[PDB]
Amino acid sequence: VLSPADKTNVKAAWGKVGAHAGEYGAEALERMFLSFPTTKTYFPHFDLSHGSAQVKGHGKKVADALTNAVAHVDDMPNALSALSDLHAHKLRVDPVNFKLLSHCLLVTLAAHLPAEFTPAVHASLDKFLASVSTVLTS
Amino acid sequence: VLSPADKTNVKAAWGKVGAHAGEYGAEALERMFLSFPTTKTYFPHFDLSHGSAQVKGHGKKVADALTNAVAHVDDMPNALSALSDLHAHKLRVDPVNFKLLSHCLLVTLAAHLPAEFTPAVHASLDKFLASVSTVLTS
Amino acid sequence: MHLTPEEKSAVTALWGKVNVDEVGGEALGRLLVVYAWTQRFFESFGDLSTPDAVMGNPKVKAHGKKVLGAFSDGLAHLDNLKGTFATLSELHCDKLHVDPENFRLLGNVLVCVLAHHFGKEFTPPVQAAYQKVVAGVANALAHKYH
Amino acid sequence: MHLTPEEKSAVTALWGKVNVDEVGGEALGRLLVVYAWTQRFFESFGDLSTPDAVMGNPKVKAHGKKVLGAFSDGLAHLDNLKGTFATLSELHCDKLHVDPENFRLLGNVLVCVLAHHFGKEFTPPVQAAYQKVVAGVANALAHKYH
Ligand code: HEM
Ligand code: HEM
Ligand code: HEM
Ligand code: HEM
């Protein structure tokens, strides 16, 4: 579970992410596609190329879903109820892919926030992420 | 999530396991150690030779907890509370080894219940050890 | 594929008693029942609403047979699953779009179903050896993903 | 380990800039903080109860330098990780009882940390290479458990 201190750290890191979330959304999405080719199988229709104008837009939609998840940290299962049916009915993406993306938001999030991504914030974020993933997989 | 029909097939399959639970538990444990040698790392203080006291008794330990779970199918988390604090705080075992233990139970059950192990029973049985696994890794 | 001279032996002898028509049918069948989402890849097979309906469907069975039939080519080239299964690898990735993660689900259902037709004879040792085969295979199919 | 010449280059290059005295401390340290259970393995390190205690613990910094040395030493043999890590794999199995699954985590915590030190330079493609390299080292360490 998420602890009060965990919550707090999540909010101060994403607060810094700020307006660059889609940027970050996307950079991650890309790292994912390159470091773990299998994740591409769920986006056969996307233009998956470096610079892709579809990859950026998606990324946003992702980052924005996370922001939304933050602002509703105490009630994530319902705050994301829809993206839950989506990722487990229509799409049906395997839980492991969720760990891969997670591992990339952290990395993307790490190269851009040198000063804030302390051990504590990395411990916190990793857990928030695990949480957001658990809701979208259940 | 366990639907009534699953509870039903589970409650049944297991009632056919009957007084053999322990015997199957130990077969299952013996299979996991032989099929996935890494799981052995959690039992370094056990003799793991063919047909030996610990495995045979620890086997009773495990089937006996599944019985308790089948019995309490409809309230699993409460009834497994103790068992979870032990597999999450003391031993702290990687959720993955849980997929392996469960596969093996299935192989084993499938091994002596030829008639009972129907594609639907195969089904529910998999969703069950999946729920038993989740409550032991929470 | 660190398969040992005894293991290889265990597998083969067993494989030669395998009723291809049944096992393959049953395995692909239990994949559709047990891991329902997989139904999504064959939406074009017909009725797959119920257990009895998936088991009973003739395309499932036939397909099942082809799949087991390929699993068989692999056991005859264990020292090189990569090359055998390359074409199907690309196939499964470029046209079909299958998360290689499901390949293990089929491997295990299959172990499950072999345990099912042979009872005793599927003694733990024998099981371990097939866990490896099923393992090399699943890896061999994921190898050409890009 | 299919490492293209380019990847091999991108890898080695970057690594020439790493300060293994400094980065290995960080990794093992972070491991102990983001993955709490991974302390069941160093009760000999004394206090490890707060992030500050872990990160600053001398024994941690020393130990991580060791680990990172073995890594660096695997990067100077990309083409033979299985062998280079054979003795150290056995050790982690026979004497330390570490579930291989924990090699991937440290491997990943590292990848995070490299990205933390280099920033923009830790570009996606370099990452892809790195993911390939930790994946291999985790398998190399895992390849002698029985
Ligand atoms: C925290 C993790 C994730 C979040 C928050 C997230 C969020 C979203 C959102 C907001 C959408 C768009 C829904 C809409 O357009 O109305 C989406 C769609 C989608 N997601 Fe995820 N996602 C996550 C992880 C993943 C991963 C791991 C995969 C696969 C590996 C994935 C695959 C997809 C696919 C294929 C779509 C639909 C694409 C389309 O056709 O527009 N998502 N996700
Ligand atoms: C359905 C899944 C599982 C169930 C129901 C289960 C249940 C149990 C039970 C009832 C005990 C005995 C607790 C006691 O001593 O009172 C136990 C102990 C233990 N289990 Fe699990 N277990 C499961 C899976 C696992 C697996 C996957 C692992 C590791 C791969 C594992 C490792 C252990 C260990 C190391 C002990 C301590 C044994 C000893 O020292 O005697 N268990 N488990
Ligand atoms: C080792 C595991 C598997 C093997 C050996 C295998 C083998 C095959 C083979 C031989 C074909 C026929 C190739 C052809 O006709 O060109 C095929 C087709 C197909 N496979 Fe797989 N398969 C495996 C797992 C999977 C799984 C996990 C999925 C998705 C859940 C899948 C999805 C499909 C689909 C949708 C087709 C097309 C059937 C058609 O022609 O309509 N396969 N597979
Ligand atoms: C790439 C991954 C890893 C590498 C290269 C590595 C390397 C090493 C090395 C070089 C040593 C000193 C070897 C010796 O004393 O003979 C060591 C010791 C040790 N390692 Fe690992 N390690 C890795 C991951 C892990 C992780 C995940 C664990 C468990 C969390 C672990 C647990 C230990 C333990 C408990 C010691 C003994 C320390 C002591 O008591 O003195 N290693 N490892």
How far apart CA B55 and CA A63 sit, in angstroms, is 49
In chain D, what are the domains?
Answer: 1-146 (1.10.490.10)
Measured CA angle at B119 (ends B59, C116), to 5 deg: 55
Note the resolution in Å, 1 decimal.
2.8
Please give the distance, rounded to the nearest whole angstrom, from the Cα atom of residue A83 to the centre of ligand 1. 8
Cβ neighbours of residue A89 under 8 Å, at least 6 residues apart? none
Give me the number of domains chain A comprises.
1
**Ligand 4 atom closest to Cα of D38?**
30
CB pair distance less than 8 Å for B34 and C54: no
Q: Identify which of A77, A56, A73, A62 has the alpha carbon closest to the alpha carbon of residue A9.
A: A73
The token pair at C142 is: 């994921």
Q: Are D105 and D31 in contact (CB under 8 A)?
A: yes
* Best residue for ligand 4 mutational test, from D41, D60, D99 (most atoms within 8 Å of Cβ): D41
How far apart CA C40 and CA D17 sit, in angstroms, is 48
Q: Sort D3 into a burial class: Cβ within 10 Å, 0-12 / 13-18 / 19+.
A: middle
How far apart CA B97 and CA B88 sit, in angstroms, is 13
**How many CB atoms are located within 10 Å of the residue B35 CB?**
22
Gaps in chain B following residue numbers (C to N > 2.5 A): none
Calculate how close chain D gets to B125, using CA atoms only, in Å: 26
How far apart CA A79 and CA A82 sit, in angstroms, is 8
* Best residue for ligand 4 mutational test, from D37, D96, D104, D111 (most atoms within 8 Å of Cβ): D96
Tokens 């970057």 — which residue? D14
Side chain identity at residue B48, one-letter code = L
Domain that holds residue B69: 1-138
Side chain identity at residue A73, one-letter code = V
Please give the distance, rounded to the nearest whole angstrom, from the Cα atom of residue B61 to the centre of ligand 2. 8
In three-state secondary structure terms, C57 is coil
Q: For residue C100, which residues of chain A lie inside 8 Å, CB to CB?
A: 38
Calculate how close chain D gets to A80, using CA atoms only, in Å: 25
- For chain C, the C-alpha Rg in angstroms (whole number) is 15
Q: Sort B10 into a burial class: Cβ within 10 Å, 0-12 / 13-18 / 19+.
A: buried
Q: Which of residues 37-76 of D touch A (CB under 8 A)?
A: 51, 54-55
CB pair distance less than 8 Å for D97 and B41: yes
Cβ neighbours of residue B57 under 8 Å, at least 6 residues apart? none
Write down the experimental method used for this entry: X-ray
The CATH code of the domain that includes A93 is: 1.10.490.10
Please give the distance, rounded to the nearest whole angstrom, from the Cα atom of residue C49 to the centre of ligand 1. 27
Q: Are D136 and D1 in contact (CB under 8 A)?
A: yes
Tokens 């190269």 — which residue? A111
**C-alpha distances in angstroms, C132 versus A107, C107, C108, D119?**
34, 10, 11, 41
Q: Identify which of C115, C131, A87 has the alpha carbon closest to the alpha carbon of residue B99.
A: C131
